Amino acid sequence: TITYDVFLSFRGEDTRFNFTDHLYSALGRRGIRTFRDDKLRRGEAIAPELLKAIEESRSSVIVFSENYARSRWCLDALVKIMECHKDKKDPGHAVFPIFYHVDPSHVRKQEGSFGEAFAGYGENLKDKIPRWRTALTEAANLSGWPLQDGYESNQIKEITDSIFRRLKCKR
Numbered sequence: 001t002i003t004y005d006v007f008l009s010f011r012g013e014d015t016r017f018n019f020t021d022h023l024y025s026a027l028g029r030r031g032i033r034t035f036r037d038d039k040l041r042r043g044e045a046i047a048p049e050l051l052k053a054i055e056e057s058r059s060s061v062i063v064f065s066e067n068y069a070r071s072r073w074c075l076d077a078l079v080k081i082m083e084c085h086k087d088k089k090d091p092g093h094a095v096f097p098i099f100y101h102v103d104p105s106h107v108r109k110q111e112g113s114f115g116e117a118f119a120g121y122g123e124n125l126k127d128k129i130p131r132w133r134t135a136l137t138e139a140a141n142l143s144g145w146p147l148q149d150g151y152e153s154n155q156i157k158e159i160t161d162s163i164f165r166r167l168k169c170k171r
């Protein structure tokens with residue numbers, strides 16, 4: 001079953017109210033139905049509604065940001081997104097990564113200030129760190145958009161145009 005065209009994965013502390021919100025609106029203007037979580041959530045494990053939303057999405061757009069790996073919920077959602085890209089067919093789950101002011105290699109290799117996040121995870125999350133690294137490394141190896149300082153409105157326009165074209169070709 002399919003409900004959304006795009007599941008928007010992002011680190012709220014970094015881009016909730018600014019870049020990802022403008023990206024969310026641009027996707028809507030193109031007729032791309034997008035799930036952008038805005039609910040208050042608490043607890044240890046990721047909310048099941050988010051995992052369910054990923055399963056019912058034709059694709060996921062990941063807004064990688066400096067502190068993305070500092071949130072277990074973002075990493076857990078990424079693991080689900082990549083398990084979906086690999087295992088799901090009819091329809092497939094496309095994955096569009098956006099490196100928002102982060103070096104793509106910092107995400108792929110878990111290096112730089114982006115990689116420092118894994119020092120804060122202890123042995124309570126030993127079993128998780130390998131699937132987290134693998135999901136990050138895999139996601140960073142899909143054709144995306146490295147975004148450095150620049151006119152964001154144009155960056156988002158090119159990104160959502162390319163996603164609109166790719167999703168229409170997948171249908």
Ligand SMILES: NC(=O)c1ccc[n+]([C@@H]2O[C@H](COP(=O)([O-])OP(=O)(O)OC[C@H]3O[C@@H](n4cnc5c(N)ncnc54)[C@H](O)[C@@H]3O)[C@@H](O)[C@H]2O)c1
Nearest residue numbers: 097099103104105108137139140141142143144145146147
């Ligand atoms: N999947 C891709 O489209 C892509 C593109 C470039 C590099 N890479 C990864 O980086 C490694 C090294 O690449 P290189 O030797 O060409 O030099 P490099 O690491 O400098 O990358 C070349 C250019 O591609 C950009 N880039 C990196 N990851 C990207 C991605 N996922 N989507 C779009 N652009 C991306 C970089 O910012 C850089 O401008 C490769 O072995 C691969 O794992 C992947």
